[PDB]
Write a protein that binds this ligand. Structure first.
Ligand SMILES: [Cl-]
Length: 52
DNA sequence: CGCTGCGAAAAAAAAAACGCATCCCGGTGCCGAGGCCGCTCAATTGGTCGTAGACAGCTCTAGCACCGCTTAAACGCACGTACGCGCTG
């Protein structure tokens, strides 16, 4: 019943959920692994901080 | 005479005066950030299905050594010429 947001499970502020959707609806591939969005929201957050 | 000293005279160069532009100080005032209000649709859960990819091997390619013959490049040096380089008007 209690739904923790994946972004929390990675300790990322970047939305690992919205990254997963954007990828599947991006037409990048047929199938997205479940680590991929994590890995990507991570890298995104990181470069966001590096500039900020 | 030469030396010299000075007295320009000539720039140097300095300094200093002028005036101009760039900074900064401190109080206006304006607008857009930043923070609340609800609310709606996109993320989560959990759970079913079916197939992408991990593995365990089987093949035969094609990539890595070795090896002298035969050249055509490389190395290299010497001589000389055309070019790059800098100053002035
Ligand atoms: Cl993954």
């Amino acid at each position: 019943a209690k739904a923790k947001t994946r972004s929390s499970r990675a300790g990322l502020q970047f939305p690992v959920g919205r990254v997963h959707r954007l990828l599947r609806k991006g037409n990048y591939s047929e199938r997205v692994g479940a680590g991929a969005p994590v890995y990507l929201a991570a890298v995104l957050e990181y470069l966001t901080a590096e500039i900020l």
